[PDB]
Design an enzyme around this catalytic site. Structure first.
Site, mmCIF file in Angstrom:
data_model
loop_
_atom_site.group_PDB
_atom_site.id
_atom_site.type_symbol
_atom_site.label_atom_id
_atom_site.label_comp_id
_atom_site.label_asym_id
_atom_site.label_seq_id
_atom_site.Cartn_x
_atom_site.Cartn_y
_atom_site.Cartn_z
ATOM 1 N N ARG E 17 19.905 -8.682 4.931
ATOM 2 C CA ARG E 17 20.352 -9.455 3.780
ATOM 3 C C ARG E 17 21.479 -10.329 4.201
ATOM 4 O O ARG E 17 22.584 -9.835 4.461
ATOM 5 C CB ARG E 17 20.854 -8.581 2.643
ATOM 6 C CG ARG E 17 20.635 -9.166 1.261
ATOM 7 C CD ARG E 17 20.804 -8.078 0.207
ATOM 8 N NE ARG E 17 22.204 -7.760 -0.063
ATOM 9 C CZ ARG E 17 23.051 -8.583 -0.680
ATOM 10 N NH1 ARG E 17 22.665 -9.801 -1.064
ATOM 11 N NH2 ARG E 17 24.299 -8.201 -0.906
ATOM 12 N N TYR E 22 27.504 -8.523 5.989
ATOM 13 C CA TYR E 22 28.100 -7.664 7.011
ATOM 14 C C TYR E 22 27.519 -8.009 8.368
ATOM 15 O O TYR E 22 27.605 -7.226 9.335
ATOM 16 C CB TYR E 22 27.980 -6.185 6.676
ATOM 17 C CG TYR E 22 29.069 -5.639 5.803
ATOM 18 C CD1 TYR E 22 30.343 -6.264 5.665
ATOM 19 C CD2 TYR E 22 28.858 -4.437 5.169
ATOM 20 C CE1 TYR E 22 31.331 -5.715 4.854
ATOM 21 C CE2 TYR E 22 29.832 -3.875 4.368
ATOM 22 C CZ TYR E 22 31.064 -4.512 4.212
ATOM 23 O OH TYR E 22 32.020 -3.941 3.415
ATOM 24 N N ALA E 77 22.439 8.299 2.573
ATOM 25 C CA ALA E 77 22.616 8.838 1.189
ATOM 26 C C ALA E 77 22.276 10.327 1.093
ATOM 27 O O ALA E 77 22.835 11.054 0.295
ATOM 28 C CB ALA E 77 21.797 8.072 0.226
ATOM 29 N N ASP E 87 19.350 22.788 5.955
ATOM 30 C CA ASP E 87 18.590 23.985 6.348
ATOM 31 C C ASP E 87 17.594 23.720 7.520
ATOM 32 O O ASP E 87 17.221 24.621 8.218
ATOM 33 C CB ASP E 87 17.914 24.627 5.156
ATOM 34 C CG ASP E 87 18.955 25.278 4.210
ATOM 35 O OD1 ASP E 87 20.153 25.385 4.606
ATOM 36 O OD2 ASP E 87 18.598 25.678 3.079
ATOM 37 N N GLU E 98 27.413 14.161 13.104
ATOM 38 C CA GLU E 98 27.177 13.340 11.957
ATOM 39 C C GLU E 98 27.912 12.032 12.090
ATOM 40 O O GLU E 98 29.119 12.003 12.340
ATOM 41 C CB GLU E 98 27.600 14.084 10.647
ATOM 42 C CG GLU E 98 27.380 13.292 9.367
ATOM 43 C CD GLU E 98 27.880 13.998 8.089
ATOM 44 O OE1 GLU E 98 28.397 15.111 8.165
ATOM 45 O OE2 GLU E 98 27.722 13.410 6.997
#
Lengths: 145, 145, 145, 145, 145, 145, 145, 145, 145, 145, 145, 145
Positions: E17, E22, E77, E87, E98
């Site tokens: 976009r 960005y 998200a 799990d 992460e």
């Protein structure tokens, strides 16, 4: 008057809608019962109802100048929302008993909180119209035992 | 009237301030549009605005005696604070649709809670003036075949 | 398409079970009504339903490359759980209106929260199938004033 | 007995030494007053006090087999803690009125929560010993209109 | 050995976009950089992106099968919502780092909570594409000290 | 009189890792035990496992059309996160029993909440594979007493 | 080896009131069924019920000295309130399975919390009297595999 | 007696189970130590333990009539649950010191809350048996000038 | 230039009760001081007090039409409850300073929250009548630097 | 363009205790590595550690006057508690990266909250000493692209 | 030193204002009593007070290098706010006992929370100066049984 | 000195950076104005600023020995975090007025909470430097009416 009975918003509707919902008892019926109960004890009793918070506050201020000794109040929906009412009562320093027709604790969680109960002499709820008569009997006894 | 439209506090200010902020649309323009929309369907429609909670409560009571079938209400700030209004609507048992011009969920966290939404037929927010028209369209279909 | 209507999980069940429970209206009926309403304004309208979050996300990404100008979305159960969906809409920057058939505020507390509502133009809930039509009416006016 | 009055833990301290009580009243004085009030209406009335949750539960179970029609209960501290008591009352399905001598709302925040009040017919607090008499009056009228 | 890089929902949109918003960096640019960085250390590296939670879960299960030694994951998200993902990672017992492009703490309050962070070796957020390279540098050292 | 057993995400991993960790029992072993138990009662039983929420939702919708009478479901991680699943079960109106191998209450606090348990006939957790057998035993009685 | 079955407060009322309310099954019926089930596996089984928390606690302490290997407990209302009971079970270190007749999750929110569940081997709720039989089946297999 | 020592539920288990777990010290050993310590100061000391809340309440009431000047109480699990116990201590107005063997803050979050601590003179926790000796030392010094 | 001073509900009671309680200072005394202070700077000072929310909202709307430059407001009890007031001030976009006689932080917890403070230029509390003077000094300097 | 590295309370302890608990790496080792890394890119780097909040604030203020371009800060325990530190960083308007050796999300719940993270460019935690190197690599690129 | 006593901020004020208020006991007096008590057991005891968090932290770090075996700490106000202090104690791994003169549970709610108590051996509050003596008794016995 | 003015952390930065951001006013400018205002009333006034909590506490202790009658304090960030400061002010029993330049209610939610406001005579925020002058005016009148 020596005793003042105040009824809050929406109490004027009592007995108006489908008198087999909650039957036939009206706000006036309640008032007449209380006035007669008070006359029996030679105590002067006034009553007041309004849907407008300000009118109720004004009436409380007037009670002070009139030498009212005790207020019996059913603030109805205003019990959960009106600090102004709390501060009126406290500001005139007239002791009061809080009355509700229905059992406030049996309904939605937001009805469990009261800006008045902690400052009342006591609270009666869920006993219908007789709750006001009980409050009046207590009030009479306090003043003339 | 068959349908009553109620506007809450501060909605009289619409289009008053810097008609480049939120443009030129006034509360009266909204009401004219709705009255014309209702006339088109041969339904009688009344409107009411006030900054005073008690005046709104009194008007809801009067709606019952007038045989109003449905209320379209924008309670504005009173949505987040007025249990008295909730209890007025419930006490007269007139179904209602809740409308807000702006998107209440996009603003501060205290505006996300409503003492009316859970009892409304439905809720429209954020679609400006058209929200009221939509509510009216729904109401017309519900009341007339 | 110019306008894209997205239906979330379980909406394919509409009218299937005991059509007397919530009657006979099906997801396809809703789509046909919307497609016709759009044709009547010379707007191209596409529709999409899935039980799979990823398929909905993918479809939103495709909407961007297709030049979709507005999304009408009933995320159903995903409204309360899907940040992925929020981020898909925001990532493609296609304005959207959130619609629900039923009144989300009149059900369990967990349904009061939405990961979409705060970014939607507006929200309609509880007005059944008409809610989507209203959203479409708004959308048409916004795109072709 | 037709009516059963239950007093919870620590109520035995009234008058014997007064825990923090005011008036010089005793639990036996309260009971004598209620027994005489009940006799005056030709209604049979029993009373019971215990510091032990299990004893109170047992007593409630016994009330069922004795054909008790209404319980007047001052659970004292157990109101805030005893789901066992709630379940005893509900399990026997005898209606009850909840009574407290003191105003439970005027004290610590934890005393604002009850495992009984929501299931009571009604609640009276803060009116001293008269609270029980009011309950009894209500009960008499309900049982023998 | 084998390192697997996983990208969550919406990360496929990177650089699509308006490359002004960005900028121009794409998901494939990121992957190329990582693949080259890994090749430079003679470590085998695979990548995976999906908008579908189940696909990502499946892929993690496959990882175990392939003897993957460490996972670098940007769940996007899904970090705030997916216990299934937590799990999966725990169930295969592959250690993981992460990574987020943007500073998750600087956004809405719901983005502050993660179902992964407490079980990650560590977390990198807000350093853009370099975050992934850092994670890979760490991983290389851990596997081939 | 068909029974459907549904297993959620990650349950396919059972017995795969370090068969000393949680032993050697596999998902297929569980399914075989259940199929044999059902055959013993002349009841037809199907099984389903997926990592994908949408696949599970679809399978539930299919169950309705196949005349499934009861669902035994271990939603695994989805119990804490999927309203979509809840709404699939409720939308087809097939009664269900919720099962977990491990004791959900003994783990992290976020595992204490379920979007299913309040609508399940009952819940069994912490009793390993037997939990499903118990659910099946109950189901058989309920369907063919 | 000895199994002890403990029933908490109010469970003595089972089958007493309007046997169509919850039918005819009594606490004695349950115990007979469990005693017969245990005889069938050559396991010695004892039972106990009380409305008094201290009696139950005493009984747990006695269980330790009698060499009881496993406790099957339906604490009824005490599950939500009694840390004493928690600490008795933990203090004697007898493993236990928690059973409820009704689905605790389907009732008021305060019944979702337990002082026992997190320390139980497992929990069964909402499957009526069979729940206890299932717990016994599990217990038998654990003690004599 | 001038000083009364109360031990709550489960404290009778001390030193019973695997004496190399939490050692050999018994409740009796504690009592013997305290009685000797009190005899050394010519102070009369009584002790009491029970698993039954009502028995503890009764014992507190008896303390008032015996002229007890201070209570040293380890309410054990009842500290977190018993408002009855709080209201017994307050009702007889005997000052008290709260003692726990173990560090109540180092365990589960629910053990951080006490219905007693706020009304105690002070609280000692985590110092084993010596906690009671320290409370007694204090009490001796106080019961003097 | 005009500065408007708004006093909320119950402030008319100032210096009525027990003039040794909070002494003798009346609302009128406050106003006279403010008027004199404003006259000194050739600024008009208008004042308004009401017990009625709607009256205060109307007065704010009137301020806009009359070109008031700044509002000094002591909402009293309405601070904690009235979003309508907040929305009136914001709707007219007159800058305002919030004043309270008493220290709102030193009282009950519900007095800690204000629907105005976050939008006020600033806030003064606890300095009695001088608070209003300080607000006015600031206001004068801002209007006439 | 200097870079300043700030280490908070307790970081001076690194490598002091039982070098096998967390090995041998000392704060000085970290600093030497960073100083060498910076020299390699021709960037001037200073370092600072203190156990005293005020010293750290003073040092940040000095950084402004010295023309520092970027701060790499490990606030250690002060991340959860120090608004003063937050306001020092913001007040001097020097961008910063937050670094922690350990995974702050894997520890107690109070460590999940930070008064810095929301204003940092980004955050690295749980990657040990390499975290600081990564922050430095980023910083070098940002200052000298 | 073998035992180190640490006094937090404001404890230097003891006995310095209105000696009939909190009487005449000084911090010095407490230290002198402790040093003498320690001398009785031939145990070396050091003491430290500061208003500065960093000084206390530094002192704890020094304690490690001195071979201190136990810390007795009254963190005063820092108990509710200083994670730095918690991490100092944990980082040097010196066991500690927490002491407060006053009953922390009897004061404002924020004083009920401690960043130390959960890691302390135990906690003594509300017993004045004797609390420290008790802690010292315990410490002596632990170190030299 | 009779009056002491205390400025907390970061207030030394006033007017230092970008004198257009918040202009040119410095902390010294504020102090000069206050010193002049105090001289005009023949009151001795001292000032103090520090970034170190302990320095501020020490200074407050010293104020007691110097006979300071009132403190005007802008604690800046320490208002939200420092119980030590609260306890210093209370422990010397010097009344105080709290001042903030900026409107603390208009910023992040954590700035809404103060460990001082509740014990302050009053609070002024958002009125810039004049806030301190106002506090001084009040203080002068209190001390030399």
């Amino acid at each position: 008057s020596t005793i003042l009975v105040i009824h809050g918003p929406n109490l004027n509707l009592l007995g108006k809608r489908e008198p087999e919902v909650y039957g036939h008892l009206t706000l006036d019926n309640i008032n007449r019962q209380l006035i007669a109960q008070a006359e029996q004890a030679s105590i002067t009793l006034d009553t007041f109802q309004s849907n407008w918070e300000g009118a109720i506050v004004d009436r409380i201020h007037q009670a002070q100048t009139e030498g009212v000794k005790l207020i019996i109040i059913n603030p109805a929906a205003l019990t959960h929302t009106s600090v102004a009412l709390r501060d009126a009562l406290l500001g005139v320093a007239i002791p009061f008993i809080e009355v509700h027709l229905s059992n406030v604790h049996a309904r939605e969680a937001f009805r469990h909180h009261s800006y008045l109960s902690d400052k009342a002499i006591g609270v009666i709820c869920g006993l219908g119209a007789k709750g006001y008569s009980f409050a009046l009997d207590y009030a009479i006894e306090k003043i003339q035992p």
